[PDB]
Symmetry: D2
Subunit: 421 residues, 4 copies
């Protein structure tokens, strides 16, 4: 509605509430605040244009404003059509960020807006899911040589970009921010663990304790989702295709079965595979009446909605972010958040302190691209662990935690080999 | 605004959304559904008038509709001015329940509406905090003849009523529903454990893991809040006045210290004491910058607001359900939900399956009073344990769980003494 | 072998090692040490004779020596033929305690020794399982009028004594020490939780994580056994006959099924029912090859050994405290500790700090019997909660823990009823 | 005492008990049983000579017998002077393994026996701490021609060997078995987590719940020790030098502080660093009376014994595997197992099912060296991940667990980039 050359938002009059959300979470983001103070002093992004595809809530907004405080000209598009928070996006538009996003936008608008964000002709692309980096290579090839590099937030995006590199069509360097220690060990595990159940509880008002919770995938996200589900009193069943991770889940005290056996007994199903069709026709047919299904992975393809639609004689919407599929025999199965990221659609995403660290790495990755892209090949890179170390020490210090320091004798001992029994 | 003899609600046009909310949670309340079918078949409350003071959200609405389906004429008032959900109440007014409640009620409206609810001339009073039963004894003594009895939902109300009995001011029988095994072992512990953190995450979007969570009170609510806080990754510090429960918290793996020591290190404070001034002036003075405070117990007197106001040079409202008290030294302390029941004010209360068992007991208590008021004395009773077992057996059956049966030989062994060795 | 009028022990030359065990655990028993200092000063048991039936390890020995330091003449017999520690018992004999116990003694010696302990003509009987109190009523009735009272340590004994009271044959007062808050909330739960797995690991050297652990009974012992099993990485399945406790186990995150379904899937079975024949023929027939079975309840009747013997074509003993039952189809099932208390036969029983509190109550119960038995009927009593409070405050102080104290305003508030919304 | 050219053991007559111990744990080692049948059928080590330095208990004996069943001639020496179990070693001598070990070995005997084990002129060396591989490089350089390669079991040894490679002193290939997923994710974490507390309870009979447990090091062992300590009811304090791992411990719910601060409040201290002097003079000076200290890492240098001896006015031995250092102010600090591997010295090491997977990898590593030594360089290698997957699949199958299979469509999706949205 409020839609022009510089932005396309639902309603600019929502900006005051968006500003309050941005100010609130920024009070609990000490690492990005530390970085923002440096950016304001040195203005390292003066004259630099940045286009970002991220989940457009208040922590994302604070990162974009941090990049702007460093001198950058920033455009932004949504990483998911349903995760955008309209009031936050109005505040971004008021701040001069060229943001193009409306909550609930269509898939075609999702890409029409992504193109508009790309119109800034970015030097740096910040991506979440690799849609924007892929879109440039497919439909905006005229702009490739102007792009220094990109940084990718999530596992699904890194998988896509590595396949792009394998096929020889990646045309600029990419930082796999997801692969940094202070990202996947914290965001993917602890962040997703809390916010997935935050969203499921918010959407349903249902009890987690005494439920059979089925977690499909025992990677970093599945681990955290299973961890916190157990912490909320649930009986957790893990479904995995990796035999090593399946044994880990056993040692962690969780049941391990395949997806058909899990489908018969699960009360709540959560997918975190980054894969396609992990739950489909024959699993829905086995599910108990009232089964809750949620996706915490990527896009909307982990739980195969077309199979649910073919089984349903009625499709209803009893609550916001709850789609009811009524089957022939009268069973009703419930899909949360239209099969999209339940933590970001049914809730407010990861907590502020988690995205502080993930978006601190993103800020450092943008600086790394700015300053090293000419020595980098069109390949996927991981940030040096020194940046991980810096983010961790800033967080610990803001926490008031002082850790042991190695003595010179101990450093010597760890490099030696003669001191045995 | 939509106010009359039979109801007083904010907006009747919100009823359609309220109905969707009631329909939803009712799908996950099997025990109360079992009872509603019995009530609908037999109509045990035909001609009976029931006045209820409860937290007016969707699970409460299904309890009130279940009583109406049993033939009762039902009036309803809010148990807390900020827990009422206006769309649910609109649906109750449309359903013929004489409900008088608006979210954000003044204290004067709170008691005016409770008086309007009493105008039904009830035979049975269902109470939640003992305000209504106290109000009849103070201001509506002409109602005492017609009143068969009352039922009290919560710990705080039962304490008040037992005190009224001790002083000899109680005039009609009272069922202490809170004292049923199927209530305080589940509602108070598991329900409050989940819904307290549901509300805290919803209000703040902050990380629970790696925080110092201080839980004041290690009763049934405190146990649950502490258990789920640990499940979400927090370090938990328990503050108690009972030495036995303090040792229980230690053995459960939690730190135990006094309120002053806890105030210095806590990041999030949760009170669940049912007592007054468990966090007060001297504790606020010790708290770290950015401390989060929330009350999970009765009323709003556990965290003493007047002390916060006197310390504050500025009182701000950065988020819905977050009050910011800025102190002279620049520190900011955040009180959630105005110091009232954080699960019911900042979220949707206990999950549906928990309220199913609690309100099943309430429905049984109302039927118990109906069937026994001529045999009861003006004192506090607890439901026979056979009702607890019925509720637990209906729930287990609806879960598809069948448990081991105690054999006749085993029963006789348990009543013998000669078989030792 | 070293067997006379004053004692019957395996070998007095083992006393030096027994003294060291007694000294060791006594360093970590601050509550009983506190009581012992009082006893040494006041000598309240001067001229009093005490006969005890307890598990004769080093914590029991310290209680008996504490009673002796108070002036008592003490005799002792084993509460279980397999839990006696011969070196501890030699030290007791060297100390002047009239102890009659040899590890591995027969059932007939178990009672022959119990009679010898009774020959002291006790004023006070301290019992664990009610064998001695029952033996007096059956076979030593000539001595009843000389006995002031008894105290019973465990749930199984209290069950027997209450049945004795019901039948009208209990002839002196009995203190149900097991029923004290500081007993069953700590000994039965936390003590049994740790020491059961202490014994199972010691006997087997097998992994607990990633195992299906079946806990039969979800009372105080079963809760703790399930708690700690989960803490060691196991998948815990709870078998219960109480529907309320079955739901508790669900809410605590454990599977709940009946014993036939549990038998098919369990890797380790632990009984804590205090009942007879909870695991029998048809369950053994369903068990997987290599199933481990252990009893943590009472006697050796919870797992029905006669059924295992009838199924076995070979009975072997591959490890100390491991009996192998080789079945017709080649399956091998393993019973720990001959079906007796696995924590006390395969290990060293509860940890010292736990039995500090249980045996502190026992010392206070003996004092309570001494001083109140003439005002007591031949019935089962529970100690006043003031003693529970005293034990808890001594433990907290020895721990360096200072708890909140109620203000006079708060005490007033909890007795009031007028202060509502 | 029973010493000769082919073996040196304490007492050959202990062999019968050693065999029972080997037979027992072998029943619960399915993966190594699977490999032993393959080895027995194919005899891949016919004519091969293998010298091993391992902790000589029953699971090690089954590994050595499995290699012998494959046709290998096997010599064995102790990996630690106090972890050897004399009856197991007696059985190995009876079985034809050239084992030279006695529990309680002097340091001189330790290296004399390791030299006797090397007299076999091995083709493959299996090492556990890199003492033997270091000893060949220092004192048996004439052996270097015939040596195909070595395999290192543990973190400390791999560090030594990688340092030897860096300095260019390594002369033959080395397999870093510790670096296999199926090893360090399970042995180091879950195995050490259980067996450390197994040993601590066995030595002390003290309560774990409600204690302040300080874990020094949050690597794989530290993670496991902390996780199981929390599972047993303790409050866990983590001391780290890695800032990333320190934040992991916080998010896992543990307190994080430096060694001096932890020394003031810890009740039980466990070191798992693989480093020297992580607890030393200044820390002992701060410790509470009665502090328990134990080492779960390499050698006995993590807790610096010489500092304890200098502080002590008295050194006593109140229990087996408990050394008491009485300080000038009367405080008593207790070091378990002489500061050596507490799980292996005060207990029976890792449980059998854990060592099954670790020693399956060792058997595969020995076969790998046999099959690849002519293609390898004098540097440190890690086994191909296909062997990890084989071990995990054999274990899952023996558990009756069948996991979901990755479909061809899903594999192709994971190698694509065009499918976004
Ligand atoms: N806020 C969020 O919701 C959030 C945060 C981080 C990452 N993610 C997304 O979550 C997904 C995974 O995150 P990760 O970092 O855990 O990936 P990961 O690869 O660590 O874990 C993936 C696991 O999925 C398992 N898997 C794949 N197909 C499967 C199937 N059909 N059935 C069962 N298990 C299967 C794999 O074996 C692997 O262990 C990605 O899509 C990532 O983008 C979401
Ligand atoms: N939905 C909800 O939020 C919900 C649900 C159930 C109960 N409640 C309310 O929660 C409160 C307690 O519920 P309960 O069932 O736990 O009561 P409970 O009495 O079991 O626990 C109360 C604990 O508070 C401790 N306590 C009292 N004053 C204290 C102080 N000054 N400092 C520290 N500890 C103190 C007492 O020792 C007691 O153990 C009541 O007000 C009850 O109505 C709220
Ligand atoms: N050191 C120890 O091993 C130790 C310590 C304390 C008590 N105990 C013994 O443990 C036993 C129980 O201790 P408690 O204090 O837990 O008793 P408790 O009564 O609290 O729990 C007993 C549970 O067993 C359940 N039960 C009974 N028969 C059953 C069956 N056939 N199948 C399944 N569940 C069944 C009951 O429902 C009850 O919940 C008693 O024999 C007591 O003496 C042993
Ligand atoms: N059966 C056993 O007891 C067993 C089993 C496996 C490994 N280990 C031994 O345990 C040790 C570690 O095993 P790992 O696999 O955990 O190593 P790891 O390196 O994963 O963990 C080591 C941790 O120690 C930390 N550290 C180093 N010096 C420190 C100090 N001074 N203070 C605090 N933290 C410090 C490092 O930061 C690192 O995180 C090695 O010696 C290994 O051989 C023992
Ligand atoms: N954009 C795609 C891919 C999944 S996004 C997953 C990413 O979201 C990120 N994330 C989680 N919570 C938040 C938040 O509150 N703000 C911004 N990003 C978030 C997190 O870093 C993770 O890598 C989609 O919606 O399906
Ligand atoms: N008088 C005080 C305290 C009583 S409320 C505490 C009660 O609220 C109940 N409760 C918790 N969640 C819900 C809900 O969603 N609907 C209705 N009652 C609830 C719970 O049973 C508990 O006993 C006040 O009203 O604010
Ligand atoms: N004597 C019977 C009944 C069970 S005894 C169970 C009791 O043992 C007690 N107990 C547990 N550990 C110890 C210990 O180390 N010493 C003495 N008593 C113990 C505990 O208090 C519990 O009530 C039998 O052996 O079957
Ligand atoms: N060189 C040092 C540290 C190496 S031992 C650490 C290794 O012991 C192994 N281990 C643990 N329990 C057992 C057991 O019962 N038998 C054999 N090895 C074991 C485990 O795999 C780990 O990598 C020393 O020998 O004392």
């Amino acid at each position: 509605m409020d839609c022009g050359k510089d932005y396309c938002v639902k309603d600019l009059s929502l900006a005051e509430e968006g500003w309050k959300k941005i100010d609130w979470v920024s009070r609990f983001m000490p690492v990005l605040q530390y970085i923002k103070r440096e950016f304001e002093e040195k203005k390292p992004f003066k004259g630099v244009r940045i286009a970002a595809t991220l989940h457009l809530e208040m922590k994302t907004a604070f990162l974009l404003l941090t990049l702007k405080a460093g001198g950058a000209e920033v455009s932004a598009a949504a990483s998911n059509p349903l995760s955008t928070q309209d009031d936050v996006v109005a505040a971004l538009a008021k701040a001069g960020v060229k943001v193009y996003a409306i909550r609930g936008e269509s898939r075609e608008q999702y890409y029409e807006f992504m193109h508009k964000a790309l119109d800034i002709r970015p030097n740096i692309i910040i991506d979440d899911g690799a849609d924007m980096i892929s879109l440039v290579h497919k439909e905006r090839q005229e702009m490739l040589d102007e792009i220094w590099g990109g940084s990718e937030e999530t596992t699904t995006g890194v998988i896509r970009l590595r396949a792009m590199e394998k096929a020889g069509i990646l045309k600029f360097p990419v930082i796999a921010v997801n692969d940094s220690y202070m990202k996947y060990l914290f965001d993917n595990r602890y962040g997703t663990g809390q916010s997935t159940w935050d969203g499921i509880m918010r959407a349903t008002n249902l009890l987690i304790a005494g439920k059979n919770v089925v977690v499909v995938g025992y990677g970093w996200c599945g681990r955290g989702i299973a961890m916190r589900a157990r912490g909320l009193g649930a009986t957790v069943i893990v479904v995995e295709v990796d035999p090593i991770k399946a044994l880990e889940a056993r040692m962690d005290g969780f049941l391990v079965m395949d997806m058909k056996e899990a489908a018969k007994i699960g009360d709540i199903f959560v997918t975190a595979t980054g894969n396609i069709k992990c739950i489909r026709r024959e699993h829905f047919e086995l599910m108990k009446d009232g089964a809750i299904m949620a996706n915490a992975g990527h896009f909307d393809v982990e739980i195969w909605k077309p199979d649910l639609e073919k089984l349903a004689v009625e499709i209803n919407n009893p609550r916001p972010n709850v789609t009811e599929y009524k089957l022939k025999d009268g069973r009703r199965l419930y899909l949360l958040a239209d099969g999209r990221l339940v933590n970001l659609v049914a809730a407010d995403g990861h907590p502020a302190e988690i995205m502080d660290m993930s978006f601190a790495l993103q800020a450092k990755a943008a600086e790394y691209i700015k300053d090293n892209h000419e020595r980098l090949e069109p390949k996927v890179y991981i940030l040096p662990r020194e940046i991980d170390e810096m983010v961790a020490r800033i967080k610990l210090e803001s926490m008031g935690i002082k850790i042991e320091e190695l003595t010179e004798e101990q450093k010597k001992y760890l490099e030696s080999w003669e001191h045995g029994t």
